[PDB]
Amino acid sequence: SVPSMSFVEDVTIGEGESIPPDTQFVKTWRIQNSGAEAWPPGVCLKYVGGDQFVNMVMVRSLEPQEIADVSVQMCSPSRAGMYQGQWRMCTATGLYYGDVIWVILSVE
Fold this sequence. Notes:
The chain is 0% helix and 53% strand. It is mainly beta. The chain has one domain: Immunoglobulins (Immunoglobulin-like, Sandwich). The strands form two sheets. Strands 2-8-7-4-5 form a five-stranded mixed β-sheet, with no helix packed on it. A three-stranded antiparallel β-sheet has the order 1-3-6, with no helix packed on it. Strand 7 and strand 8 form a beta hairpin. One of its GO terms (biological process) is negative regulation of DNA binding. This is Protein ILRUN.
């Protein structure tokens, strides 16, 4: 059975937030199992496109309607500008599911 995931909110690094160049930072998202059954074992959040700032973090097997805070350790690009990365949940078998979530940086 295919799992579900909905984006709750950006816990850090909002759509409108500026970080300096080459600066280390943690990116945290709040997500939920918006499905009828628990997530299977061995699920993870994976990098899937756009700019990269490390491509996978394990996430716990959430019960239906449960919330989780997922954190990824990143580093802002060396030059100024607007950058965007995509992430998406993935099962132990390699199947992606859920909402695509974003990291959007304005380096100044």
